[model samples]
Target: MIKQRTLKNIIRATGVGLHSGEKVYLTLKPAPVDTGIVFSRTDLDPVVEIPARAENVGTMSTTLVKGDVKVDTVEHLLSAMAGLGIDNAYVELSASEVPIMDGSAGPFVFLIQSAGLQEQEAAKKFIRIKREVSVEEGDKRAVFVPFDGFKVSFEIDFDHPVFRGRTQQASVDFSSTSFVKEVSRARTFGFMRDIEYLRSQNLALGGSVENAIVVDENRVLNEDGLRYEDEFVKHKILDAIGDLYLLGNSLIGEFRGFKSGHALNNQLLRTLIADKDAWEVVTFE
Candidate 1:
């Protein structure tokens, strides 16, 4: 039986936030059972605990943060948390947002592994999906299917010049070793057109080719092109994995997405939580 786990000792990381352009120092240390997942903002005069639970989700557009004060671009860490089967832990941030290290979760994966996750004496809880729940917005769609273990399959629809016709799909079980090798390194990408728009709105202040794969109408400006030819779709799965972690309770179900985004994915959680009959908490043995 899986049980709540946390780092054996405090591990630290420092880098720039993808959107805030502010440097953030993150420390992932140990925590007691049932503490759930949380992030502490040291930048805030009086540090506040932002639990990484579904209901605590503040905004759903790019990265999920805590309330008005957030650790921008946290999906990577969140993805690592869920992928590693971490049920309880704490992420202390010296800045308002998490550093978007290389625009992927690879750094976090290494940090967590180095910190060394130690399972507690207690059992781990999982939210088994017994009923189907789904949501759609415009051209995007996402759904949850009953499965014994957490899984995700995704596909992207884009026919840009730099990338392919957008043909790719990944079916993965959370425990597979490929979790990190295949999904964690996938880098985040942004549109060249939206760069100016977002920056004008005081967003994407810290973003550049160094942090993300910037794509224009014709092609990506990064000389290295993409880390993975199918990186666009690969990052989609990475985001989906991170978004699903908002369930508060770790899930035991299959998630399928067809170009889903933050909004619809968060709504899917709402729909799933709306019907208690759809899921029930199974305490660890």
Candidate 2:
């Protein structure tokens, strides 16, 4: 069975924030069991703690807040945590967002691995699906289906030459080692046309070919090309992991999506949580 965990030592990394256009430093370290995952805002005047649970979620540049303190673009770190089977730890940030760090979860996963996981005495808790729950927005939907382990599949409509009909899906057994090597290097993607509009919303300020797959008329401008053949949809899966981290526990189920985003994923969690029959708090033994 998977077990609760915290790091043996603190690990740190520095990079640009995905939205803030600021260089940030982030640290992950050991915390007592049952502490879940708390994000401490060391950048604030006085440090404030934001537990990484479903209830602390707020706003949307993929933002999460604990009381007045906030973090932006948290999907990368949250993705690493969920995919890496980490629980009961702390995230200390020197800014409002976790560093963009290659615009993928790979760097964060490496950071966590460097910290060395320690199994806690407490059993790892999970949110096991007992019934189906879903959320929809326009033509997009995110659904949680009952299954024995976590799985994610995403279908996106970029409607562009490079991404016209691409789709990617994979079942993560939680016990499988394929996650880090297969999905972690898939970077986020955005259209060149949307750059100014994103900046208008005060987001994507740190986005560039350096850290993301930037698309133009018919191709990706980045010389390195795709890290994974199906990277775009895989990154969507990555984002889904981070968005669902609001649930605060591992989810035992298959996750289905068709062109979903952060809000839709969060709404799916809210919908599931609202239904008493939909899920139960469980622990691995």
Candidate 3:
């Protein structure tokens, strides 16, 4: 049987929060089997523990909340954990948001690799889709269907000229694709016009060309272009992988999305979870 996995050694890193623009320190520590991914706010008087579960999700950027305490922008790190097949770990944050290292899962992937993986005695668990579950809002949609292995496909349509001829649809089959090479380095992107509005709304305060792919009306503002030809769509897949991980087990299914973001992804999980007949927990031997 495939065993549950966690870090072998505690690892630490520091960076700026994408929304708060505050310097945050992050620590990853090993956890017991079935402990799942739990986030703790170390800066609080009494540390608040927020388990990475779908029910605890906030509407913005895959935030996890417990009463008054919240953790922001957790998807990237969560993506790395899921991609690396990490089943349990304790995440300690010194601020409200996870550091937006290059706005991708690459940095987090590196940290996890540095700490190494330790296999536990318990078998790994998977949430296998038994029936199709879907959610939609207007033109946005996301769905999960029964499949033998983890797979993701995403499509995006942005009106910007920078995206016109670029590949806007991408897919990854985890059985064949390397998450570190194919998905982890795909950075989140935003338009220059949205930056001003996002800042006005107190969002994207830490976003810049340094961390995200910033595009103007006519061209990409970053000197180094995209890591992958279909980066925009691939990043969507990356986010979905992280959002789906909140189910508290790696998924054994196929996910398809069209113009879906964090909110739609969370909605799809909630819809699937609400209907017990849609999925079942299984262990491999």
Candidate 4:
């Protein structure tokens, strides 16, 4: 039987938050079956608990919020957990945002592995798609369709020289692809001009080449370049993975994104869940 899994031990790390620019500490701990992924704000007096659910998601990045408390930029870490098939875990943080952590899910993957994984007695549940659900914006779209297994396809079209022609497409069927090697290592990327604009808006204060792929109009500013030739598209798929996981359970469907980011992905989830006939929850025997 396919059983739910969680960490065998607790692991912790410290880094800077992408938006807040404050030093943050994150602790990943094991959770009992059915606990799902819960985030705890330990810095608060009474402590605030936020479940990783679609209804709780906020803007820009995949954020979890309840009342006045918020935890920002959680997509990368959630992406790692979902990619590795972790069913239940506890995320404890000392600040309002998750760390940037090299702008990829690699660090969180390493942390989860270091703590090892423990299979629980309960069978895993998946949100199986029964009907097509989709959301779109001007030239950007995200969709989920019924499929036997999980898969992701993404395409990005950018005006920059780095993403011209056919270099903006990628597809990953988890049945054959290694999420760690092919997806988790793909770093978040943004145009230099956009980063400057974000800075002026008092956001992404800790973003830099060390934690992301900083691209200029003509070239990539990072000396090491990309992990994969079509990494930009792949990272889009990575973001989709994290955003979709906000459904609060693993999904059995094919997800395709075209120039879609966090917002559209979350919107797709909302649309899917809102329609009673669109999806059903099931457990694999």
Candidate 5:
């Protein structure tokens, strides 16, 4: 059987929060079997621990909340954990949000690799889809269907000159895909016109060309350009990978999304759980 795994040693990192714009420190520590992925706010007078589960997810940015305490911008880190096959760990945070390191999962991947992985005695668990489950809002949609292994397909449409003549759809089969090379380096992107509005709404306060691929009306403002030709859509896949990991177990199914963001992804997970007949918990032999 494929055993569950956790970090072999503690690792640390510090960076600015994407939404809060504050310097945040993170520590990754190994967890025992079945502890799952948990986050603790070490800066608080009394530390607060929030389990990374879909039910605890707030409506925005894959924030996980336990009572009054909350952690924001966790998708990238969670994506790294899922992509690297980590089953349990304790994430210690010094602020309210995970740091936005390069606006991609690449940095987290580096941290995990530096710490290394240790296989636990128990077999890893997976949520295998038994029937199709889906959620939709307006024109956006997210769906999951039974598959032998993890797969993701995403599509996005941006009516901007920079997005023209670029791939708007991408797919990944975890069995064959290299998450680190194919998805982790794809940085999150935003438009220059939306920055001011996002700041006014208390979001994207730390976002800049340094961490994100900023696009203007005519072209990308980043001097180096995209890491992948279809980076825009690939980042969506990255986000989905992180968001789906909130279920607390890896999935054995195909996820298809069309213009779906955090909300739709969470809704799909909640929907899947509510319909008990749609999925089953299983382990490999």
Candidate 6:
């Protein structure tokens, strides 16, 4: 049988949050057989439990808020968990934000590997698409279609030479692809002008070339060019992988997105769920 997986033991690390510009301590522990992934805010007066599900998501970044308690910026780590096939975990953080380690899923993948994985008795559940479902906002759109295994296709349009050249889109059929080697290392990117404007709004205070690929108006500003030439779109796919996992299980479908972000991804999930007959939950044989 295809079994679920969890960490063999607990692991801990510390780093700075990209938006908060503050240190955060993160701990990953093994969860029982069917506990999916749960995010706990340790800094709160009483610990807050936020299941990593679509209903709890927020915009720009994925935020899980329960009552007055909130935890933000979890997509990167959750994407790593999805890519690595970690089905259950107890994610405890000392701050509301998950550490922006290198601004990519690479660090989280490394942490999960170091702690090792253990299989559980339960069969893995998957959200298999029964028909096509889509959501659009003018030119921006996201769609899910029937597929044998998980896959993603993404296209990004940025008004810059770095992306206008040739690397504007990326696709990954996870059926035979290596998530870590091909996708996990692609760092989040931002333009210099946008960073300046965001800083003025008192946001992204910890963002810099150190944790993201900083680009100028005309060229890539980072000392090292890029991990992969089509990194811009690949990072978009990475974000989609993390965002889609909010469905609470692995998906057996193809995800396609064009100029979509966190908000659109969550909308797609909500749209899919509301249409009840569009999908079916099942366990692979």
**Clashes in each model (backbone N, CA, C under 3 Å)?**
4, 1, 0, 0, 0, 0
Q: Work out the TM-score per prediction.
A: 0.91, 0.92, 0.97, 0.96, 0.96, 0.96
As a TM-score, model 2 comes out at: 0.92
Q: Deviation in angstroms for 138 in model 1?
A: 1.8
- Per-residue lDDT tens digits for candidate 2, residues 1-285, read 667888889888889987888889988888887787788888787788877766667733477776667887778888898877788778889988888878889998898888888988878888888888888888999999999878887887667788656554444455563669877778877787788788889987888877788888788888585788778788888888887877888888889889898878888888888898999988754
Of the candidates numbered 2 and 5, which has the greater TM-score value? 5
Q: How does residue 251 of candidate 4 score in lDDT?
A: 88
Q: Where is model 5 more than 4 Å wrong at Cα?
A: 165-167, 200-203, 223-225
List residue ranges in candidate 4 displaced over 4 A.
Answer: 165-167
lDDT tens digits by residue: candidate 5, 83-202: 999999999999999999898899999999999999999989999999999999999999998999999999988788887665489999988988998999898777888887888899
Better candidate by lDDT, 4 or 5:
5
Residue pairs with clashing backbones, model 1: 2-124, 3-124, 71-97, 72-97
TM-score of 4: 0.96
CA deviation > 4 Å runs, candidate 2: 165-177, 199-203
Between candidates 1 and 2, which one is better according to lDDT?
A: 2
Whole-model lDDT per candidate? 0.78, 0.81, 0.91, 0.89, 0.90, 0.89
Q: Candidates 1 and 3: which is better by lDDT?
A: 3
- Greater TM-score among 1 and 6 belongs to 6
User: How much lDDT does candidate 6 score?
Assistant: 0.89
Question: On a 0 to 100 scale, what is the lDDT of residue 84 in model 2?
Answer: 78
Clashing pairs in 4: none
Model 3 pairs in collision: none
